[PDB]
Design an enzyme around this catalytic site. Sequence first.
Site, PDB file in Angstrom:
ATOM      1  N   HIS A  37      44.853  10.179  47.960  1.00 21.62           N
ATOM      2  CA  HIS A  37      43.860  11.211  47.672  1.00 21.62           C
ATOM      3  C   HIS A  37      42.469  10.667  47.382  1.00 21.62           C
ATOM      4  CE1 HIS A  37      44.633  10.874  43.182  1.00 21.62           C
ATOM      5  NE2 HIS A  37      43.382  11.297  43.117  1.00 21.62           N
ATOM      6  N   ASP A  82      51.423   9.539  47.799  1.00 25.57           N
ATOM      7  CA  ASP A  82      50.033   9.275  47.432  1.00 25.57           C
ATOM      8  C   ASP A  82      49.651   7.796  47.430  1.00 25.57           C
ATOM      9  OD1 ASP A  82      47.407   9.780  46.761  1.00 25.57           O
ATOM     10  OD2 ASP A  82      47.810  10.510  44.733  1.00 25.57           O
ATOM     11  N   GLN A 169      40.335  11.180  34.915  1.00 24.70           N
ATOM     12  CA  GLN A 169      39.458  11.265  36.081  1.00 24.70           C
ATOM     13  C   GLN A 169      38.706   9.961  36.341  1.00 24.70           C
ATOM     14  OE1 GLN A 169      37.670  14.553  33.781  1.00 24.70           O
ATOM     15  NE2 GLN A 169      35.662  13.539  33.954  1.00 24.70           N
ATOM     16  N   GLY A 170      38.898   9.399  37.533  1.00 21.37           N
ATOM     17  CA  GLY A 170      38.244   8.144  37.867  1.00 21.37           C
ATOM     18  C   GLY A 170      39.192   6.952  37.873  1.00 21.37           C
ATOM     19  N   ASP A 171      40.416   7.134  37.368  1.00 24.20           N
ATOM     20  CA  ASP A 171      41.409   6.057  37.338  1.00 24.20           C
ATOM     21  C   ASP A 171      42.401   6.089  38.511  1.00 24.20           C
ATOM     22  OD1 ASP A 171      40.640   4.742  34.875  1.00 24.20           O
ATOM     23  OD2 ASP A 171      41.644   6.359  33.775  1.00 24.20           O
ATOM     24  N   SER A 172      42.420   7.179  39.269  1.00 26.59           N
ATOM     25  CA  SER A 172      43.352   7.288  40.385  1.00 26.59           C
ATOM     26  C   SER A 172      43.257   6.097  41.325  1.00 26.59           C
ATOM     27  CB  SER A 172      43.093   8.577  41.174  1.00 26.59           C
ATOM     28  OG  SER A 172      43.410   9.724  40.396  1.00 26.59           O
TER      29      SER A 172
END
Length: 223
Positions: A37, A82, A169-172
């Site tokens: 993603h 993913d 948010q931002g660690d994916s």
Amino acid sequence: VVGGTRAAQGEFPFMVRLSMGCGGALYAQDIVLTAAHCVSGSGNNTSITATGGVVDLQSSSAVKVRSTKVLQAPGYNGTGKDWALIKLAQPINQPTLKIATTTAYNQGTFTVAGWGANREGGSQQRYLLKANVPFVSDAACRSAYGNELVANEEICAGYPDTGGVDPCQGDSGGPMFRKDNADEWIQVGIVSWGYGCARPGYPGVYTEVSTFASAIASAARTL
Ligand SMILES: [Ca+2]
């Protein structure tokens, strides 16, 4: 990472920061393993930047390398699988992270790291943050997410009862890892999603690497 602490320079050298606000691990010096993603699809792509070599993104020692191509998990549509690989124009000369090929390490206490927010709705981090998150069974995770949880393709971690420590948010795309029986870090997950961040009753969900390891390995040979 919510509830994380600063990682030491050189502690997790396989970590890379990606320009779209994702983390990633050096599967090979010139191939980044991240989340599907985090990219829009497969193909030649020179618009992505990977920053490696440092915990401090503002450091003059940072190495910034551009991508050449992306390989997103075939058939990805937001329901599992993913994972994605990003080929780099030049290699990043740092240690790589071995991925788990069996499920023997899908248990115990894991470690995660990233430059994502340390609070819901927060801004990105300048310094790499790390945290330890315990494995959460599929059942407990399912008590929270029901059918959203893709059996056998997703693994959960964190504190189901009280939250407090969880990627955000931002660690994916960042790797979730732990020691194997040879005292070496091994990757069992990829930061994927969760409801909010660090909330009691809602553990973090991760791509179950053991399930896709053979696919990741084959795809990487073609890059
Ligand atoms: Ca699972």
